[PDB]
Design an enzyme around this catalytic site. Sequence first.
Site, short mmCIF file in Angstrom:
data_model
loop_
_atom_site.label_atom_id
_atom_site.label_comp_id
_atom_site.label_asym_id
_atom_site.label_seq_id
_atom_site.Cartn_x
_atom_site.Cartn_y
_atom_site.Cartn_z
N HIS A 12 85.52 42.47 77.38
CA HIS A 12 85.48 41.54 76.19
C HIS A 12 83.94 41.56 75.59
O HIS A 12 83.67 40.44 74.66
CB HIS A 12 85.82 40.19 76.30
CG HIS A 12 87.38 40.18 76.84
ND1 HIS A 12 88.58 40.57 76.05
CD2 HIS A 12 88.05 40.21 78.07
CE1 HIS A 12 89.68 40.68 76.73
NE2 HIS A 12 89.42 40.35 78.10
N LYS A 39 96.37 49.04 75.94
CA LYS A 39 96.44 47.54 75.89
C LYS A 39 96.98 47.14 74.71
O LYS A 39 96.43 47.84 73.49
CB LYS A 39 95.09 47.13 76.48
CG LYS A 39 94.89 45.57 76.71
CD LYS A 39 93.70 45.22 77.55
CE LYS A 39 93.41 43.55 77.90
NZ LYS A 39 93.85 42.65 76.69
N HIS A 113 87.84 35.24 82.13
CA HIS A 113 89.01 35.44 81.18
C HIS A 113 88.93 35.16 79.73
O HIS A 113 88.20 34.12 79.39
CB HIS A 113 90.25 34.43 81.97
CG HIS A 113 91.57 34.49 81.06
ND1 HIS A 113 92.43 35.43 81.17
CD2 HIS A 113 91.89 33.47 80.40
CE1 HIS A 113 93.31 35.01 80.61
NE2 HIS A 113 93.04 33.81 80.04
#
Length: 120
Positions: A12, A39, A113
Amino acid sequence: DNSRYTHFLTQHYDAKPQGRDDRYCESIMKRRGLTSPCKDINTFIHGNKRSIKAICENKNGNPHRENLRISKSSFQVTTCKLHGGSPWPPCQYRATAGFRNVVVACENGLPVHLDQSIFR
């Protein structure tokens, strides 16, 4: 042990994105190992890392929902959304650039996350 923060960066974080268009997605997705299988949706934060880590502090974050933090600042961002009917390569992605705050989870002051829901 923060292998999870490293994995956050891998999945990310892209400091200085090239084009952020479809072919940017199709490329960075492959380059970061997110294509086996494809993904379905994945979002990259741009800018510096300081800012992302700071979401873990009160510096640049507030507590959010149960386990998460939402940033105070807005980040430049590219969402890559898998197109077509196959979970298997080649993975064709549509890119959506955006600009807004992000939601992460933090362990020991580091983002581990990204919450993808706000980009779906």
